[PDB]
Design a protein around this ligand. Structure first.
Ligand code: K6Z
Ligand code: K6Z
Ligand code: K6Z
Ligand code: K6Z
Ligand code: CL
Ligand code: CL
Ligand code: MG
Ligand code: MG
Lengths: 229, 12, 229, 12
């Protein structure tokens, strides 16, 4: 623990500064440090954790695709070697995040909003592994993503309203999992449509602030349906 | 690759 | 030398891939490796080196300014500590680049286009140090930047045409040094104007391709003069 | 800070 000697509150303060500086690698290390303090995370802290690693892994995924595309076109070892380098570092980030979730974020998360959040993240990071998987564990990696998403979905449906932004973001990502990872485009479409319609019918219950939060994610579901249909 | 909308920062 | 066991040509290939993937930290490490092979760099290779480190140090400078600004407003230790962290890493990059230039890029660079290029870079990386310097070596850091720029300028004026893009980029950066580091805005203005006018009067000698290269940098000189006058 | 135009990538 590089961050073992820094106060929890200082690590959270520094994560927030790192976000402002666009130093996402630092933001992610600071939030890793905070989780390793062993206390549960607040809503805000969960969002810091997620944003930090999304940003880190986002850069690696983007780099991977560029390198993978060049490699495909090329089909010397250099292209493959460098795509492998980036891929390995990507897998490491996913491994680290899954690490934090299993030791011990998920088992201590009893509230719907925390448990759903973490299980969604678990699905997400298995999905990122799945995006680069080519060998004898691909099927199991994919099934790990499905399993995580499905538990999250079951909890979300039982414990949260249809407009709950966490529930909506989960359905969005599970929908993309179906479309592109499980090669189940009809499932992806059905999930996205059903999720949008059930959210639309519940907007009447919300404040203006909540309405804004929900409709933002509903538009993402719409954006995908437009490309898909 | 065409990337679909997923939750949170469009960091890729 | 992390890159001691990779072929020079592979390191250059991988720098180019890293540029395409926007992996500038990797691009910079690969080019460090290439310089440490001990052979001189080609024009293209010099440009790879410069682009890689410009990008790395650019992110750190941007982060530093964000953190410095928050710290100024705040005037707990956390803001200062984290600005210091970023500042130290920034200084390290500058130290590394200056390292490569003195061991042994500059002493082996005999052609105007290579020597001017490297001395410009030396000025640049001392300037970046100067931007964050606050102690008893600030004056000497500033003078190191001036000294490097001035030798570059003397060579460039004697050996290159006024429209030479390297010469023009040097004058641009030396001009900004004067304005903002040496607190010499009149010198900055005189240099930028004289450089623009002498370039304008030489454009007639150029091909279309060269004309494009020169006028691009001339517009930067103009952009600065507009803000300055 | 207002940053002035310098050579090469506007990376900051
Ligand atoms: N990037 C960041 N610094 C954060 C984003 C969000 C967020 C809010 C709504 C929807 C998605 C993300 C945060 N949650 C938060 C903020 C303050 C108090 C309680 C919770 S922190
Ligand atoms: N930290 C974790 N929970 C995991 C990381 C990785 C991994 C995948 C690719 C490269 C590096 C690590 C896993 N692979 C895996 C998953 C499910 C079944 C069989 C194998 S699980
Ligand atoms: N970012 C890159 N990969 C490069 C940029 C430039 C450059 C060209 C003109 C002006 C500024 C920079 C390069 N120089 C070069 C390219 C091919 C052959 C000989 C020399 S490489
Ligand atoms: N590698 C190099 N050539 C240098 C690096 C640094 C440095 C500055 C700040 C922080 C870390 C390193 C120098 N400082 C300096 C410069 C001129 C005169 C007195 C002192 S020289
Ligand atoms: Cl590699
Ligand atoms: Cl720190
Ligand atoms: Mg059908
Ligand atoms: Mg005057």
């Amino acid at each position: 623990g590089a961050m073992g000697s820094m106060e929890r509150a200082s690590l959270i303060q520094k994560a927030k500064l790192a976000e402002q500086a666009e130093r996402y690698e630092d933001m992610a290390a600071f939030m890793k440090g905070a989780v390793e303090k062993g206390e549960e995370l607040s809503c805000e802290e969960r969002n810091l954790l997620s944003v930090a690693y999304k940003n880190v892994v986002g850069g690696q995924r983007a780099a991977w695709r560029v390198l993978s595309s060049i490699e495909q076109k090329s089909n010397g070892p250099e292209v493959r070697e460098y795509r492998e380098k980036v891929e390995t570092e990507l897998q490491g980030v996913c491994d680290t995040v899954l690490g934090l979730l299993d030791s011990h974020l998920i088992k201590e998360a009893g509230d719907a909003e925390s448990r759903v959040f973490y299980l969604k993240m678990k699905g997400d990071y298995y999905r990122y592994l799945a995006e680069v998987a080519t060998g004898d564990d691909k099927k199991r990696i994919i099934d790990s993503a499905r399993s995580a998403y499905q538990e999250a979905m079951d909890i979300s449906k039982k414990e949260m309203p249809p407009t709950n932004p966490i529930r909506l973001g989960l359905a969005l990502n599970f929908s993309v999992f179906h479309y592109e990872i499980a090669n189940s485009p009809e499932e992806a479409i059905s999930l996205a449509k059903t999720t949008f319609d059930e959210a639309m019918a519940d907007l009447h219950t919300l404040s203006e602030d909540s309405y804004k939060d929900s409709t933002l994610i509903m538009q993402l579901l719409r954006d995908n349906l437009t490309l898909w249909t | 690759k065409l990337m679909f909308k997923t939750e949170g920062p469009d960091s890729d």
